[PDB]
Write a protein that binds this ligand. Structure first.
Ligand SMILES: *[C@@H]1O[C@H](CO)[C@@H](O[C@@H]2O[C@H](CO)[C@@H](O[C@@H]3O[C@H](CO[C@H]4O[C@H](CO)[C@@H](O)[C@H](O)[C@@H]4O)[C@@H](O)[C@H](O[C@H]4O[C@H](CO)[C@@H](O)[C@H](O)[C@@H]4O)[C@@H]3O)[C@H](O)[C@H]2NC(C)=O)[C@H](O)[C@H]1NC(C)=O
Ligand SMILES: *[C@@H]1O[C@H](CO)[C@@H](O[C@@H]2O[C@H](CO)[C@@H](O[C@@H]3O[C@H](CO[C@H]4O[C@H](CO)[C@@H](O)[C@H](O)[C@@H]4O)[C@@H](O)[C@H](O[C@H]4O[C@H](CO)[C@@H](O)[C@H](O)[C@@H]4O)[C@@H]3O)[C@H](O)[C@H]2NC(C)=O)[C@H](O)[C@H]1NC(C)=O
Ligand SMILES: *[C@@H]1O[C@H](CO)[C@@H](O[C@@H]2O[C@H](CO)[C@@H](O[C@@H]3O[C@H](CO)[C@@H](O)[C@H](O)[C@@H]3O)[C@H](O)[C@H]2NC(C)=O)[C@H](O)[C@H]1NC(C)=O
Ligand SMILES: *[C@@H]1O[C@H](CO)[C@@H](O[C@@H]2O[C@H](CO)[C@@H](O)[C@H](O)[C@H]2NC(C)=O)[C@H](O)[C@H]1NC(C)=O
Ligand SMILES: *[C@@H]1O[C@H](CO)[C@@H](O[C@@H]2O[C@H](CO)[C@@H](O)[C@H](O)[C@H]2NC(C)=O)[C@H](O)[C@H]1NC(C)=O
Ligand SMILES: *[C@@H]1O[C@H](CO)[C@@H](O[C@@H]2O[C@H](CO)[C@@H](O)[C@H](O)[C@H]2NC(C)=O)[C@H](O)[C@H]1NC(C)=O
Ligand SMILES: *[C@@H]1O[C@H](CO)[C@@H](O[C@@H]2O[C@H](CO)[C@@H](O)[C@H](O)[C@H]2NC(C)=O)[C@H](O)[C@H]1NC(C)=O
Ligand SMILES: *[C@@H]1O[C@H](CO)[C@@H](O[C@@H]2O[C@H](CO)[C@@H](O)[C@H](O)[C@H]2NC(C)=O)[C@H](O)[C@H]1NC(C)=O
Ligand SMILES: *[C@@H]1O[C@H](CO)[C@@H](O[C@@H]2O[C@H](CO)[C@@H](O)[C@H](O)[C@H]2NC(C)=O)[C@H](O)[C@H]1NC(C)=O
Ligand SMILES: *[C@@H]1O[C@H](CO)[C@@H](O)[C@H](O)[C@H]1NC(C)=O
Ligand SMILES: *[C@@H]1O[C@H](CO)[C@@H](O)[C@H](O)[C@H]1NC(C)=O
Ligand SMILES: *[C@@H]1O[C@H](CO)[C@@H](O)[C@H](O)[C@H]1NC(C)=O
Ligand SMILES: [Ca+2]
Ligand SMILES: [Ca+2]
Ligand code: NI
Lengths: 5, 5, 495, 6, 776, 71
């Protein structure tokens, strides 16, 4: 539940 | 497929 | 071989032009009925996308994306004049002529151009609009481009009351009288009215309909206008004396039905004979004894009825019956079984002395046809994909068409055998002796052609019926036989 | 089937 | 009745059978498999000839070596193998593209084929040594092909399904070309020859028939016609009173009697469409004397129907047949290399020649934009999408991937420095201009110019032109938002002195090019549809051509300028001083791209520092104006104080992006990549940390969906010794932070579980791992 | 007034009454004076003037600030 491409 | 009208 | 793609019509000169961009590209000119085909351009043309006409000068303009060429030619023929060509005309796709200027669209450049129609002009074209995606065509909407006065149309017929023609009015280049065309049936002696063919033709069943087709492959006129019916029409046979077609119907999963429809000018709704009967896969009419024979598949019975309905009787029990054919003048009746063992069976028309005629190499013998003119039996097996012929004894078995596809209807008339194919959705024909002249009678139909019959205006074999005399001595039902009239009892109980 | 082999 | 020596009359007195033995085989091409059918007595035995096939199309065999030849459509190659399955080796490794059919000349030892995309008929030796285009004149869609090499006939047949379909006959050297069948065909598909009776069998897929006819086209008969058995026949071969054909519509191989078309039966069914078929037997290839056994022809020696010699000498693409008519010389004249999507062609500079056979075509390109060449060694260079540069010789040999260009994106432009042996290219993805060395056995590459914020950096470079003497790069540039303007720019070839030459109404700027002799730049602007000129001084500027649609490529050679318009689908020649004499070279050519002229330029006519002083620099040499040279080093290395040797980049900074990890120097004047970039598949970087003493860079990957893409990795700044550091026990959210203790050798990191978070330690080069804190 | 970059036109629509009436004012002819790719539009009801910003095209029409009467 965080930042990815 | 099947032999029907 | 030809593929006409873009077609234009000229009511003034009374000609029909079209472009062809397949193998052997060309521009063709023809009458309004497509009967005097001539080629205008056939050299230095590849992929003519579109063509247009200026009526006041009588030139045909066309565009070649494969040659980057815009050219024009007179109606009467001669030499092609190059209007515009070169690198700066990559893909002209559509053209039109208005007054002194031509207007065309270019697919690559996404522009609609306007330039002088006269060849050898060197003025750069003006752009009407730009950045239009996927341009295909351009046409002029003007009264000047579609003249209506008789003087401006060279006294064209069909301007008043359709020239008196019932269906179609085709003018001819220099004649003062129009050639009336017929959508269905044949043109009468009156020369402007249409009636039924009054000749021999095929009939076939299709979804919701009974449809008609001429024997001549080069005659495209319908012998009669399509008859519309409720439910799928599965099988049909023709009654000469009353000029009506007896045909069967399929409703729901199991609700079969039998009806008849008249081919006279009345053309009323089809009159029902039975309802609530099982699915019926074939039907035959006895012209001598005036009884109808039909097969019920869902109920494993072949049964007989009078032409009025009335008395009904079982003729045989059969594992999977399809087609039936009758030979009343010799008292014999044939039918096909595609059950656990597939076989063709023969009995008297009373249903007695049942014997199998051919009971080897058969899997789905759907179709059956008997030829009285040569005394041979024909059948079409859908699993083996073959049409075969034999003597009525089944001795001289021969293939007549190998790879027949998924045969269902079969009939024979003159020198040819006609069959319906459920796989390709076409009717084919072939020579009845050796299958040589094989052509497709129909294009790929929109749904499966379910059964086929002839319509014959001449009486068939007219042997004397022994059953009329005191009902042939029987108490209820009687049918002709090899020796004498054979009695049957109704199915309403035990007899 | 369309004639082109690709 | 009588028959040829290969046959014997039977007791019937009118039927002949083969001499005996050899058990004739029938070989069929299905997409994945070459099926062999061994015709043992009356039955059939099916098995695969070869294990490693992608899409087989054509088949033929050689009776003298016992080899089976095939074309693979997806690989773009011709192969052969022995009939027993051993010694698989390549015949043509490049330059085929939808090769339709093959025919082996067992007497002349030659190999003929038809090609659909090239629209040619080509011939080569049975080893594929020498290649030329035999017939291209009126050829549109050649498919079927057959030969009669027996002395006295020496004719070839082919079928064309173009706009005017026909079957043509010609001598096997392509001289006496004539049309034999043009009357009742729509889709001619597959040909075969009955050698004993001298009949040619052909088929049609639209009219659905099989017919045979004599060599002159007269006595034609129908074998199978008006028969629903034929759906879409493709290839045909006959043997002993039978025809075997492949039908693509019904996907099965059929047999029938070759005279009356009866006795029809299936030989085999196929899951895929069966395309080619051939019957392997000595009967299928009768022996004859070889007229060219004693010939002195260099290169190809082709059999011919000419009575005296029955042979003619021919020579590959790019050679002239000398006046001796036995020897051939190299055609050193220039030719225009027309880059297109999916193929690069070599066309003659003469507009009257429409052959496209100046070089062996380079098929199988993807997203083709630009090209370069090195006349020495005769190599052609183009870039491939995945970030590679490929090479091939003008004769189709030595096609290999030369070197990897960039790990950060795909390159667009190309330019070759032919005296220092360097290649300059643009990579608009990473927005840099870099160089790569052609000399030596080891590849070295340096980013020369990068996108800093200033007007002088590259914004989005499209084209490159190099001037070996006077040592300047020129490039065309679309600019960037809030930085670099759309411009024509120049630099020293070492990247030192950035300069803006022209800026103005350039919006859809295309490739730049240079006329070295006149020292003027040329470029095209799509937004205005013009081609412009300009001095390299940046002073004089003018419009040369008007009213273009979408110029893509342009090149200046001699007194003429050649440009290709992608929207007009044309290649045109104009004078380089003005438009004036417009001449069209090619038209109706789709997918046009950049252009280049292959011509003789030598290291003698122009020299610079890097040519005068080889071995001065240990890695890269870059010339600069005034005849001097600058040494340089590959990515990850810095030039030593000696100005000649290379050393690892001791001081730089690390920036981490989600796609990659990259290093930049502290001194802003150095645009080179100070570290070999960590990129490629499986990279999703959150943070990076460094280990200066031991020379390592630690980073943590992240992946929400795919596991094993989570963890900590290490790598040296030179790109060596990649190793996973932490892999086990990563939380649902990955390692969210990394910190290295350079004194104690401890590595701190954070695990991010869904409702928990750990701080952990790991001793480097050691399995000891501990949790320090757990928080919620 | 509104711009339709999909159709390369500047159009008008009527607010008064229960029946809507719409017209296209300027389209993309070959000339630079036409509409290339309209982004913004500002109208001056008095003095009867209409102003728009154009991205231009790969054609005669350049990137420009253009003006026209509201007819
Ligand atoms: C292999 O075979 C090919 C084809 O037969 C030969 O190629 C020809 O070679 C000759 C000799 O080099 C070329 O002739 C030269 O062409 C140059 C370019 O000319 C352009 O303009 C002319 C029209 O004026 C066109 O015909 C031509 O296609 C070009 O567009 C000229 O600049 C050269 O001129 C120089 O020499 C002449 C003659 O002495 C002088 O008068 C001039 O002042 C000048 O010094 C020259 O004419 C010819 O163009 C080539 N043809 C092709 C198709 O490219 C190969 O030479 C041959 N190779 C071998 C070794 O056998
Ligand atoms: C975990 O394990 C890894 C190996 O898997 C270790 O990695 C090695 O770390 C050592 C650290 O010393 C590295 O050794 C260093 O290499 C440098 C590069 O050498 C090149 O250049 C020198 C000239 O400067 C040449 O002599 C040499 O041939 C090479 O061309 C050297 O510059 C370093 O020199 C230092 O140590 C030497 C020896 O004591 C002294 O003489 C010098 O003055 C100087 O202090 C040094 O030799 C080694 O390269 C690493 N190998 C790998 C595979 O990367 C990690 O260190 C270890 N992890 C931890 C945290 O300990
Ligand atoms: C599969 O079939 C091929 C074709 O028959 C076999 O190739 C042949 O193999 C033999 C034995 O190795 C070769 O014999 C040698 O011939 C040379 C003369 O050319 C002679 O000097 C040697 O002493 C030897 O006799 C033969 O040349 C070769 N055929 C060809 C055309 O090259 C192959 O061996 C078979 N595969 C297997 C696994 O058996
Ligand atoms: C084929 O025949 C069936 C009925 O036998 C047609 O079915 C009707 O379709 C229309 C809509 O097109 C419905 O409103 C009717 O209620 C349907 N009738 C029944 C009995 O279901 C069908 O349209 C025909 N299709 C074609 C292509 O001929
Ligand atoms: C297929 O039909 C043939 C037709 O003759 C059947 O052969 C007859 O079989 C009966 C019963 O065995 C014999 O009494 C006849 O003498 C046979 N006729 C001849 C002339 O052979 C045959 O039995 C049928 N096959 C099947 C499986 O029913
Ligand atoms: C095709 O099959 C035949 C056999 O049906 C092969 O010929 C025989 O192969 C066996 C293999 O052990 C040998 O022992 C025999 O001596 C062969 N000859 C004969 C006459 O039986 C034949 O080799 C096969 N064809 C190919 C080339 O695969
Ligand atoms: C290629 O095709 C063209 C067009 O059919 C041929 O040109 C024709 O040649 C014949 C003589 O063979 C002349 O009668 C025609 O007038 C020519 N037509 C035109 C428009 O030029 C040409 O000969 C063929 N060339 C080759 C090499 O086959
Ligand atoms: C197919 O092959 C068979 C042999 O396997 C041929 O057999 C002959 O067929 C005719 C048909 O009228 C018979 O009269 C002959 O007696 C048969 N001869 C023999 C020796 O069996 C047959 O001719 C071939 N098919 C065609 C269409 O000709
Ligand atoms: C181009 O490829 C050929 C092979 O097709 C190379 O020639 C071989 O080079 C190796 C080098 O060790 C020799 O051992 C072989 O004897 C050569 N001949 C063959 C037929 O393999 C050639 O070196 C390549 N050229 C370049 C510049 O890469
Ligand atoms: C039309 O076709 C007929 C029949 O082929 C022909 O005789 C006639 O000359 C043609 N043209 C005219 C003027 O009817
Ligand atoms: C089959 O015959 C039965 C009587 O035996 C009859 O009730 C039924 O209608 C027929 N077929 C159907 C529709 O099941
Ligand atoms: C590191 O890289 C060198 C050179 O690639 C290699 O020889 C060596 O085995 C590697 N060592 C380790 C521990 O990865
Ligand atoms: Ca075109
Ligand atoms: Ca077909
Ligand atoms: Ni562009």
């Amino acid at each position: 539940x965080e930042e990815x491409x | 497929x099947x032999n029907x009208x | 071989v030809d593929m006409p793609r873009h077609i234009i019509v000229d009511p003034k000169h009374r000609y029909l032009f079209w472009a062809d961009y397949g193998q052997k590209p060309k521009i063709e000119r023809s009458f309004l009925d497509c009967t005097n085909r001539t080629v205008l351009v056939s050299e230095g043309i590849v992929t003519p996308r579109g063509l247009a006409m200026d009526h006041d000068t009588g030139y045909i303009y066309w565009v070649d994306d494969s040659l980057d060429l815009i050219a024009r030619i007179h109606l009467d023929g001669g030499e092609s004049q190059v209007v515009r060509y070169g690198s700066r005309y990559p893909t002209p796709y559509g053209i039109t002529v208005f007054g002194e200027s031509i207007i065309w669209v270019d697919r690559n450049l996404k522009k609609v151009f306007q330039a002088s129609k006269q060849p050898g002009n060197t003025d750069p074209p003006v752009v009407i609009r730009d950045k239009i995606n996927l341009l295909r065509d351009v046409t002029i909407f003007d009264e000047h481009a579609q003249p209506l006065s008789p003087a401006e149309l060279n006294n064209n017929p069909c301007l008043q009351s359709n020239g008196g023609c019932s269906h179609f009015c085709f003018a001819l280049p220099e004649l003062p009288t129009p050639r009336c065309g017929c959508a269905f049936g044949t043109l009468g002696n009156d020369g402007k009215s249409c009636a039924t063919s009054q000749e021999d033709f095929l009939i076939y069943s299709l979804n919701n309909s009974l449809r008609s087709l001429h024997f001549d492959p080069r005659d495209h006129s319908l012998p009669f206008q399509v008859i519309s019916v409720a439910g799928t029409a599965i099988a049909l046979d023709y009654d000469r004396r009353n000029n009506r077609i007896f045909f069967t119907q399929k409703l729901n999963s199991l609700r079969g039905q039998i009806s008849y429809v008249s081919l006279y000018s009345g053309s009323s709704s089809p009159t029902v004979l039975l309802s609530n009967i099982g699915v019926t896969d074939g039907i035959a009419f006895d012209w001598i004894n005036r009884r109808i024979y039909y097969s019920d598949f869902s109920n494993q019975t072949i049964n007989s009825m009078a032409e009025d309905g009335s008395n009904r009787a079982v003729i045989a029990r059969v594992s999977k019956p399809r087609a039936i054919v009758l030979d009343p003048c010799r008292g014999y009746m044939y039918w096909t079984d595609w059950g656990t063992n597939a076989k063709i069976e023969r009995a008297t028309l009373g249903g007695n002395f049942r014997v199998p005629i051919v009971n080897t190499s058969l899997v789905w013998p759907n179709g059956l046809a008997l030829d009285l003119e040569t005394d041979l039996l024909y059948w079409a097996d859908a699993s083996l994909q073959k049409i075969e012929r034999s003597t009525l004894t089944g001795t001289n078995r021969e293939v007549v068409v190998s790879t027949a596809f998924h045969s269902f209807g079969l009939t024979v008339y003159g020198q040819y055998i006609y069959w319906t194919d459920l796989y390709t959705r076409k009717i084919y024909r072939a020579n009845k002796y050796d299958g040589s002249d094989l052509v497709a009678m129909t294009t790929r139909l929109p749904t499966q052609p379910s059964g086929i019959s002839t319509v014959v205006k001449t009486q068939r074999q007219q042997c004397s019926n022994p059953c009329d005399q005191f009902n042939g001595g029987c108490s209820h039902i009687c049918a002709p036989g090899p020796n004498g009239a054979e009695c049957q009892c109704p199915h309403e109980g035990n007899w | 089937x369309x004639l082109x082999x690709x | 009745c009588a028959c040829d020596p290969e046959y014997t009359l039977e007791s019937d007195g009118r039927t002949c059978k083969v001499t005996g033995s050899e058990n004739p085989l029938l070989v069929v091409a299905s997409r994945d498999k070459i099926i062999v059918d061994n015709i043992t007595a009356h039955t059939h035995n099916l098995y695969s000839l070869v294990q490693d096939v992608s899409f087989v199309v054509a088949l033929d065999f050689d009776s003298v070596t016992g080899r089976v030849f095939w074309s693979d459509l997806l690989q773009g190659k011709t192969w052969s193998v022995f009939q027993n399955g051993t010694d698989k080796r390549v015949v043509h490794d490049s330059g085929l593209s939808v090769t339709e059919m093959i025919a082996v000349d067992w007497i002349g030892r030659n190999l003929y084929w038809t090609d659909y995309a090239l629209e040619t008929i080509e011939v080569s030796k049975i080893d594929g040594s020498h290649r030329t285009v035999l017939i291209s004149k009126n050829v549109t869609k050649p498919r079927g092909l057959a030969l009669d090499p027996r002395m006295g006939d020496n004719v070839m047949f082919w079928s064309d399904w173009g706009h005017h379909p026909r079957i043509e006959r010609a001598s096997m050297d392509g001289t006496m070309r004539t049309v034999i069948v043009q009357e009742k065909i729509y889709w001619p598909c597959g040909l075969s020859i009955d050698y004993p009776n001298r009949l040619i069998y052909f088929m049609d897929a639209y009219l659905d028939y099989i017919e045979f006819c004599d060599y002159d086209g007269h006595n034609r008969r129908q074998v199978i016609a008006s028969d629903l058995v034929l759906h879409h026949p493709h290839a045909l071969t006959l043997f002993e009173d039978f025809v075997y054909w492949t039908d693509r519509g019904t996907r099965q191989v059929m047999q029938a009697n070759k005279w009356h078309g009866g006795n029809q039966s299936v030989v085999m069914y196929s899951v895929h469409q069966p395309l080619g078929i051939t019957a392997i037997h000595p009967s299928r290839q009768p022996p004859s004397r070889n007229p060219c056994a004693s010939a002195s022809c260099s290169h190809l020696c082709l059999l011919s129907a000419q009575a005296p010699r029955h042979y003619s000498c021919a020579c590959p693409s790019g050679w002239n047949l000398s006046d001796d008519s036995v020897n051939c010389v190299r055609g050193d004249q220039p030719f225009l290399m027309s880059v297109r999507d999916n193929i690069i062609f070599g066309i003659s500079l003469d507009p009257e020649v429409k052959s496209n056979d100046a070089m062996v075509p380079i098929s199988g390109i993807q997203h083709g934009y630009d090209v370069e060449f090195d006349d020495s060694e005769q190599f052609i260079y183009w870039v491939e999408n995945p970030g590679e540069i490929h090479r091939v010789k003008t004769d189709g040999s030595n096609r290999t991937v030369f070197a990897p260009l960039s790990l950060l994106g795909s390159s667009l432009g190309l330019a070759l420095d032919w005296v220092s042996r360097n290649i300059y290219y643009t990579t608009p993805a990473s927005r840099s201009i870099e160089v790569l060395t052609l000399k030596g056995d080891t590849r070295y590459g340096k980013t020369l110019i990068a996108n800093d914020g200033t007007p002088l950096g590259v914004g989005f470079p499209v084209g490159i032109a190099v001037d070996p003497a006077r040592g300047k790069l020129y490039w065309s540039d679309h600019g960037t938002d809030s930085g670099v303007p759309a411009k024509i720019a120049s630099a020293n070839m070492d990247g030192t002195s950035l300069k803006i030459l022209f800026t103005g109404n350039l919006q859809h700027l295309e490739v730049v090019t240079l006329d070295i002799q006149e020292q003027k730049l040329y470029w095209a602007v799509t937004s205005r549809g013009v081609i412009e000129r300009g001095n390299v001084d940046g002073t004089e500027r003018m419009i040369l051509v008007h009213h273009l649609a979408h110029p893509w490529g342009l090149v200046v050679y001699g007194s003429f300028l050649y440009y290709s318009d992608e929207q007009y689908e044309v290649i045109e020649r104009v004078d380089k001083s003005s438009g004036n004499n417009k001449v069209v070279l090619r038209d109706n050519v789709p997918y046009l791209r950049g252009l280049r002229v292959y011509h003789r330029r030598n290291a003698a006519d122009s020299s610079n520092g890097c040519s005068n002083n080889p071995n001065a620099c240990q890695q890269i040499c870059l010339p600069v104006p005034g005849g001097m040279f600058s040494c340089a080093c590959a990515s990850g290395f810095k030039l030593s104080p000696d100005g000649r040797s290379c050393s690892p980049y001791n001081s730089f900074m690390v920036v981490s992006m989600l796609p990659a990890v990259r290093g930049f120097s502290l001194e802003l004047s150095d645009h080179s990549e100070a570290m070999v970039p960590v990129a490629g598949q499986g990279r999703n970087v959150l943070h990076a940390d460094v280990d200066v003493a031991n020379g390592f860079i630690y980073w943590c990957d992240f992946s929400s969906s795919v596991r094993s893409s989570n963890g900590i990795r290490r790598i040296k700044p030179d790109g060596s010794n990649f190793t996973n550091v932490v892999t086990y026990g990563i939380g649902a959210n990955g390692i969210r932070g990394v910190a290295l203790d350079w004194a104690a050798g401890n590595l701190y990191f954070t695990n991010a579980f869904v409702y928990e978070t750990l701080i952990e330690v790991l001793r480097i080069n050691t399995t000891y791992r501990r949790v320090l804190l757990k928080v919620s």
